[PDB]
Symmetry: D2
Subunit: 499 residues, 4 copies
Amino acid sequence: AGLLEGVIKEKGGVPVYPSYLAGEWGGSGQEIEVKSPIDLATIAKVISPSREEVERTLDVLFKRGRWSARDMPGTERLAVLRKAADIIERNLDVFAEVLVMNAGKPKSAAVGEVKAAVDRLRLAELDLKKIGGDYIPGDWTYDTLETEGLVRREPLGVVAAITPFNYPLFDAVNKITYSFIYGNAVVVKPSISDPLPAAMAVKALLDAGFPPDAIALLNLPGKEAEKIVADDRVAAVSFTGSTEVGERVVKVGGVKQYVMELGGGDPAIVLEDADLDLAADKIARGIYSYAGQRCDAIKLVLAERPVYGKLVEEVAKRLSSLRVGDPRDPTVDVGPLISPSAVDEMMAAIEDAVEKGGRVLAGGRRLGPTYVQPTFVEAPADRVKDMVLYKREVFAPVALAVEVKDLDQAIELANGRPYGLDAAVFGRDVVKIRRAVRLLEVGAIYINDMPRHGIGYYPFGGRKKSGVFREGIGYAVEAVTAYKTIVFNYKGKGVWKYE
Amino acid sequence: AGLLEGVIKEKGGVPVYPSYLAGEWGGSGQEIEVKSPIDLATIAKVISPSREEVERTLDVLFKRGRWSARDMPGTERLAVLRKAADIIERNLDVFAEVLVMNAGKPKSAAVGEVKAAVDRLRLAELDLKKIGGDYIPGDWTYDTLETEGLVRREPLGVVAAITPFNYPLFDAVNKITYSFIYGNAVVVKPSISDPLPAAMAVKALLDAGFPPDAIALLNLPGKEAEKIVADDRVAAVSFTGSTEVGERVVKVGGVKQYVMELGGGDPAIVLEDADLDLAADKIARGIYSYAGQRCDAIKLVLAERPVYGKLVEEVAKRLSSLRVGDPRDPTVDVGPLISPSAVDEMMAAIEDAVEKGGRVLAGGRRLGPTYVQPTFVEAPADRVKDMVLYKREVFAPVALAVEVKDLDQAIELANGRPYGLDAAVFGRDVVKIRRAVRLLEVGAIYINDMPRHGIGYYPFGGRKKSGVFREGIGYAVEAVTAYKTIVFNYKGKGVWKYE
Amino acid sequence: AGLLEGVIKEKGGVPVYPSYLAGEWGGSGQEIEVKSPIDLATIAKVISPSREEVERTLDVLFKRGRWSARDMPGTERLAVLRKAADIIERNLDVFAEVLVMNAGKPKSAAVGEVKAAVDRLRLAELDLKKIGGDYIPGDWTYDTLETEGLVRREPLGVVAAITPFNYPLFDAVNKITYSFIYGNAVVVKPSISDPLPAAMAVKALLDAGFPPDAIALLNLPGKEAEKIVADDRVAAVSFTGSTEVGERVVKVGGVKQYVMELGGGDPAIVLEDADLDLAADKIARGIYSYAGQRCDAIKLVLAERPVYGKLVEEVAKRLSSLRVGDPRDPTVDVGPLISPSAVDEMMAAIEDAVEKGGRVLAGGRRLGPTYVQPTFVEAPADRVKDMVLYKREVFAPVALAVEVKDLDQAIELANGRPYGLDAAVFGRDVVKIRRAVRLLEVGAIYINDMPRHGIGYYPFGGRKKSGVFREGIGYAVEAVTAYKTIVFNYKGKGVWKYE
Amino acid sequence: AGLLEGVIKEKGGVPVYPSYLAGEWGGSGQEIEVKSPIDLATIAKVISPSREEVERTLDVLFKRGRWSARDMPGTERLAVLRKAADIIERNLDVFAEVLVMNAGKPKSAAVGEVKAAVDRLRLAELDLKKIGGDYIPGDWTYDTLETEGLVRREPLGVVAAITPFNYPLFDAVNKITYSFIYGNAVVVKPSISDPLPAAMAVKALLDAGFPPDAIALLNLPGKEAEKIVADDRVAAVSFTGSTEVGERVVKVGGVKQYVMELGGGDPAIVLEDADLDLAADKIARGIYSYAGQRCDAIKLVLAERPVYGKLVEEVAKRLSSLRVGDPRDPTVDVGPLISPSAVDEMMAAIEDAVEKGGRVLAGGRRLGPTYVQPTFVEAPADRVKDMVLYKREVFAPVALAVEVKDLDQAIELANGRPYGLDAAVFGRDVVKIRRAVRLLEVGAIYINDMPRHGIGYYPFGGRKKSGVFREGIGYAVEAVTAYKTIVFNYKGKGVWKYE
Ligand SMILES: NC(=O)c1ccc[n+]([C@@H]2O[C@H](COP(=O)([O-])OP(=O)(O)OC[C@H]3O[C@@H](n4cnc5c(N)ncnc54)[C@H](OP(=O)(O)O)[C@@H]3O)[C@@H](O)[C@H]2O)c1
Ligand code: NA
Ligand code: NA
Ligand code: NA
Ligand code: NA
């Protein structure tokens, strides 16, 4: 259809999306159904590549792709990304519709993601703020006298971009952009759950001029991807997903450069001097956006005694006034969760909190196989730590509320989860804020706002179980680039006169 | 003895070195013999820690060490490292003697390593050139308007420093220095082959004021160390060693920050316009230094036809005039190899080259279980690629010599090995040099000098099978530090007026 | 006409260009004739502002302009510059025609300048590579313990951009771009000799959305501009012009931030191993481009004995084959010099060289009041230093040729002029090149190419009499921005625990 | 005496200090008396150089000094500065005594300045955080394809360091250190008022190994120094002093690189949520330290209505409890002002404030020709702006106190003075603090502390009448260094393949 006109194959009434094998769209592997969480119906099929096609694709990426990407000057790479942005932008409605149907994303959120993808592509020139190399004079040590160094970055070669289901379009475009801008070839491996947006993005890139042998899109399910990760032709792996899969990926990959964005949720702290209107609004939104299916979703709210009552009151009201059900209605605030399993886990998690002294302050009602109300569970500090909702990341619209004596207890409870992605702090006192900033063990802290990675204007990434390394405009250069040092020796050659 | 007076325990006529358990020297595990390659005799014993002591040590490092190191202000950390430098310097002869006896290192090389360790410690202030964070204004995007970012570095926590046998003193001091200067606690795991120098360095650091609960020295053999690497309290692993072990380390460690310096040898290219006197001298030295037991040792020499004859002639003469045997004589140029196995492998490798058309131009004679002559094997370009000396790193004083038609063939053969640590290029033409620099796939290129990492004044590290990431003054901050982003939200707060 | 439709006033058959007074185009001062060097005819008139209008303009720029520019977020400033680029691009022929007629620039050179202006505007996002601030931790000194610093850039306010005649369009657009991208208001003061292109550029910027009260274009002759420079509301002065005027500007301005690009010519050195075809081509072009009316024009050629003959032979041939006369013909290689005076000076300078032992190798013939042939004058090393062509910058297509014994003499003669803008070195030996690079006292050295600032992709600027500070993408931030340091004190506040 | 044993010449009972003429201590110019503000007695004499000696000194600095400094490798420069630190440190009491006697500085302050000088010297290695150059790849523009750039810093040559009377030791050592660490020669021109400490510092540097022909110390009074500033061999001028003299210096110097630290006082703002104990303490100290003879002294206190009463009450008490009189007593809090004139001006300024509605809250009594009590004058917001104490910098221990309605009025009044050096803000609310930070027009803002430049750990400098450019560890590289760009051309040379 338009963008994917000659690519998609209507077979048996259901559109069949092929993989892109670094040159031609195709695939001879098993076909796999792709369903919508809105009605559990099959909306398309994707053709996975065969072992032989995976092998051939990697061979093309390694032997030719690395050079096609590297030998396309930066000035053209930029033109490619900008053109791709234009193509995605003019196909906005189509990109959004697929996000709504395939991911169950509310219309406004789907439109927001497409626009993030477009902006990420257009701002590729900002990534150059970290591209320059270093010139190191040698006269600061006797052994390096009359010597000199140049340190420059080089692309690693083939980057494997593995993406999650919750940001099927942005994550693929983001990783492709930063991997490509520095001269790398890329193998994209999207969630087999909602791989359609990536296929659409890759086509837009190909139409825009992206070297055809420098990119690949493989519709491989879970462990079928290990094959790519473990291959020596893959110099780097950019992975966004769960802690457990991330661990498996590194153990399969071995020595390579990695960026591991492993999520988990985020805690939000509200100090007694906080603007409770701003806090309640931002916290409610951080809890329910995209039905809590956000790595930076708020999963725990900690509020100092003097504001805990009002704060939790306001958040409860806001969550209760939300409208759930089918995401197409520009009226719905919350669509479905990606699978009935995800809802099952949320319900069980809520029961666990209740059995351990927790009390539901809002929501709690399952509305269908993939529908549930955003839930806010109050818990006493002395018991919250043993609750599943605390110890784990329940990927759903659910957060715990805990009253705390002071900042130290807030910080202590916030750091008590095994994760350390982001944290939020609402308050105004510079000293308490500076203290929280120093002691919260997370990759990023949001002062007076809900955690939101956006397009990575500010770098983000994990600590503890949330992973290692960062993504962000400019900063991602560290994950897909290697340094090259050139040491020039002029010892006794008369350039310098003892210096 | 002096430095290790109350630490070393003379038991059964052989000095017994205990492990340092983040607080007290001790150990209840198996005792292990430490031998000299000079005479295969046992010169000491080291006490390995028990599982329980490993567990307790990690617990101390994690619960207290991270904070002792982090809460010691940088100004004191620097004083600690400087004081340690003074202590090692005044104990120079003792440090050197142990290197000579334990590692079989020629006196001058042993003295050189101690001085490198001392300088590395004293120049810790230079590591600060990469410590500052970034302030990111938010008005360059509409979504971040009235927003602002601060990105600063933080220590990761506990860094596991795993070191090889060939630089038993420097590698431990280097990793400790860059890990500690940024606020990390450190677990050192030296080669069980020559762990004595590390014990001496750690004691000097402790005497200098290094927080006692922030450092540990565990004498664990090979796979006993996996226990440390795989532990969640270990946030980073700095490993210098072989490709194969490095792979195992990552597969055991899983997600963490890694610096993998995996060696392999280096190729040296000589262009027709090169100063052949300089080239022959530097290349000969790169081949035999420390009996080729250097990750940056020259293992392949490629010379353009018009200079190949003279060049190879000169290098052969130089290697032949070398004096082998016991390293104590300030007369000996080459001491023994670390083990009889290493020599066996070298001899077999030489036979392989010969059976495949290779011709010995210098050396070739084994002089004892751990002694051999520096060898230079000529090989025709059409057969060298299948030789063990080419396909593998034979850790010994042996290199291949190959005549080539031109630069492209030189580059092609240089890149043909599975490694990519450093490469050397001797010549004067800027264009040919720039071309080689762009196309040699290695972490570092040395123009008109043999490859020499020194103390890391210039960053170095691998490509391909030689690993990932870099070590160097300043640059090592990337391996033992994590970024922390703080996003401040002032939306609608009146700080800015639409900007 | 189109772009300047309602701005230009046809009065007495000659188009009258008004000044832009930070809000409205106008002027009540003396009217001044603008002539073409192609035929000495009056092609337009410009209205200079009255003292009162200068005062009022500065008042608007200071009281409102600083804030209009600063309060327009960077994201919009960028959109403004990009839109201006589009407007200039679609009006390319018109912009070029005026450059050809007003500056006497050959068509291709005029087209080249317009395109440079367009690209400079479009690449404003690259200027951000130097916009970020610094975060300075305080624990590296005892006195700053529990303290912390943030260093960010801020616009200075009102930047006075004073431009020369030889790049009437680019220089104005360049200075405006880097001054505006960081948040400054700008007063442009173009050469009263060819102020038309600036008027056209400013209009394009205004049409593009440039805050109307944040920019001004004042058609003031020479010393009438001192009034602007000396004013306290002008925080910076970006000046490109002659050494003598630059000196006067600083002496009138007093304490302020300055960028002084004071030209002078450039020497070119040819080593014995140089590609003489490349060298002859580039050197000939550096001598005659835009009739030598380029600050980076080659004014002295120094060649080692073994190549001097051929080199100078080839350059002479190339200069002789040039076609002079009226710049409209896409056939002409060289148009006229800006004024008959400039030609007079060139002729006198040639006579001086001849009277002192110099010999004309090419050109020498004046072809009219403003026309002359590109001239190449040979001179013996022992007499060249006293020649006007050496001691001074003769802004015309004329260069000296001097044979030298070796590199040291080349370097010595190159450094003998009172200028130090750029220098060129053709050769291949890295050591000789590195030596020349270290010893040539100039802001920039071009290896194997003629000196060419282009759009400042690489920073450039002077040494010695050629001025101070640099212009260039990114680097110009230093001239139009000031640092702001914020020191936070948390002494004894419990953020840190002794560190 | 010891340090200056063979240098000082006891003549007529009064020690005579000669100038240092870049090689030998001497001087044939007029002798000038140096007096103590403690008793107006002559304590020494300094020999000014003759015109001929000034000329010869500059000739030595230019022809040999530039090279002696530049050709001494950085590693030795550092050793020189460190050794000088040791020499000054062991002569601490002697250095302090002279500061007490010559500058009238209280013992503790004199000891503090010597220690700042010592630390500044020892931390010269931190200045290297800004010494590295940039490597600029050329493929981000079509015109620069197959091209490449290197941008490195170079010393300017001869830096003229002109210093004020209030920090006679530190300012000279600071400027010398940052000028020398990057490879420059230096001419020091101290205040003829208290030039003794500089003579002592220069000797310590010479004894430490500072190249003898690379430094000069000229005891020239006021306008006699213009001769140095105006000379073409002086590539940069680092000046710390009054606005008026700074202006004269630039007008005499013309085009050169300048750092102008022109002082003026600083305003301090106290928000309603401020810790008034901390604020009162820090503000009182900022008002009286060294008898207000500090460029960063607090001259205006602005406090929000709800805390104004207490705050001003507390500061008054603190100022009243101070002990004035002869600085030798480790008991005295405040010594004398540098001259009776300075006190006259302060008294007249106080009368002016009183005649305009001001009321003295503390002090006001002159105690002798050079002694006065620290004074705090209350003034109504509607009249303060016309007071001399507001409009001018009265270099003495005197500040105005003004009650304000809110932050906007505080900011408005703070920005109302013609200066913009530093400002202080005491309070805790992040939003109000961020607002003040954005709107205060000064080089530096101190949050919750009095303004204190210290040794420049954090860069500082002026805005408005307070000057241009910054000094600070690292940042001063901009004032005494110039960039050198090297552009390499590989167009069509086969390094890149279209990229
Ligand atoms: N260093 C570089 O990068 C660079 C680049 C391009 C050109 N240049 C140099 O500039 C010169 C060619 O340009 P040009 O002939 O037009 O030189 P110029 O006369 O020095 O240009 C001076 C600019 O300053 C104005 N001006 C003149 N007197 C002034 C005064 N007293 N106060 C304030 N402003 C004053 C001029 O306006 P009026 O036109 O009204 O006199 C003109 O706009 C050559 O020496 C060339 O090498 C240097
Ligand atoms: Na692997
Ligand atoms: Na793990
Ligand atoms: Na002025
Ligand atoms: Na001058």
